[PDB]
Design a protein around this ligand. Sequence first.
Ligand code: HEM
Ligand code: HEM
Ligand SMILES: [Cl-]
Ligand SMILES: [Cl-]
Lengths: 181, 181
Amino acid sequence: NNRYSFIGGRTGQWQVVKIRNVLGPGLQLVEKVNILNGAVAEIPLDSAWRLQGFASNIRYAIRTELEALQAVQPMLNRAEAILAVLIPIKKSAQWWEMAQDERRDIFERESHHTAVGLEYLPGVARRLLHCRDLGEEFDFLTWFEFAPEHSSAFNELLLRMRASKEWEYVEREVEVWLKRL
Amino acid sequence: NNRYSFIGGRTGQWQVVKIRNVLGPGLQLVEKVNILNGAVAEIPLDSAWRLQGFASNIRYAIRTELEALQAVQPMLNRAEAILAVLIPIKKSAQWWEMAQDERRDIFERESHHTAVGLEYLPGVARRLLHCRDLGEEFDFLTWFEFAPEHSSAFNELLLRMRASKEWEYVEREVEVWLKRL
Ligand code: HEM
Ligand code: HEM
Ligand SMILES: [Cl-]
Ligand SMILES: [Cl-]
């Protein structure tokens, strides 16, 4: 199943360490996030919010980039990856109406998204989900997990991305920091 | 709503003229297709099949291609466009695992999808829906409508697309021919 759901409330496999409402309307603070590999129509009991998304095909990466990523990127659910961050992102209408060459160019040519991100591997594992096409309030759910030794680095990476040309098109962002139970 | 449903059965705005089961398992012949702008969970009565998909962003086309398209493409629902064709398509796993340059190269550089399609405008109006990400049996719903004068040309377009390098990755195709009621 390509669909993943994230419910904030009182149960789950992850403990909320903090929520930072970086840009736009935030998410309600909760104790835990429950992560399910399927849809959830039935709004669980004592739950503040539900995010969902699907895994999909590659939209921007070229073959050489894919090859570099595969050389180094870690698997999920390594024993030592006890910290996680879930970061929902929405981009602007003006981003979405641009053509495929235009977005590619802002993403890599000007922003160096992949080249920059590669400097933080293999410390950081990641998953990417899409949800604009489902009509969610966010366009993407991003997922990162790592050992604590890598926390400072991850924080450096966030600040680099947010200085990029790409991030001028980001109109909503929340970081949910977690700890594995 | 970006979601569209197509219900084959005994009612709808469109009459089935014929169905051609071009490649893979076919669809049952029905009298009518009912088209709805929304998700439909409840399979209507006396209905043989439901297709669905969503309108999404551009995945391949570059700015100049977009500009060329906008200059000549017709709107849907012209009074003259009394014929339509719904064409579901599934592409192979080998296509989906390819990187974005690879796919782009096969789509335009090798198959001239956009350049070839442009020759059939403004006679032909079109809409593209995506459904792989929803778990559907097909990856895409393609929709075409035109006045009868253009039926010949449209048939010619189909045979050209099917001769392209792109069509080598196509593992499932049905033509549903329709007449507006
Ligand atoms: C940690 C190393 C990172 C790597 C190696 C990396 C790599 C990538 C790659 C290769 C893509 C393109 C996927 C495709 O072609 O479909 C991508 C997309 C994305 N990444 Fe990252 N990324 C990293 C970190 C981050 C971080 C920290 C964020 C956000 C805080 C982020 C946000 C995004 C978003 C939103 C997309 C989707 C862009 C779109 O489709 O418009 N990435 N990432
Ligand atoms: C009539 C003129 C046509 C034009 C101008 C045309 C144009 C296009 C364009 C520009 C795209 C790319 C959209 C994007 O970047 O996301 C596209 C996608 C597509 N077209 Fe066509 N098209 C035409 C006819 C057809 C026909 C007859 C078929 C199939 C029988 C077809 C099947 C597709 C499919 C499946 C896609 C999605 C490709 C993918 O993501 O792999 N088109 N079309
Ligand atoms: Cl990914
Ligand atoms: Cl379209």
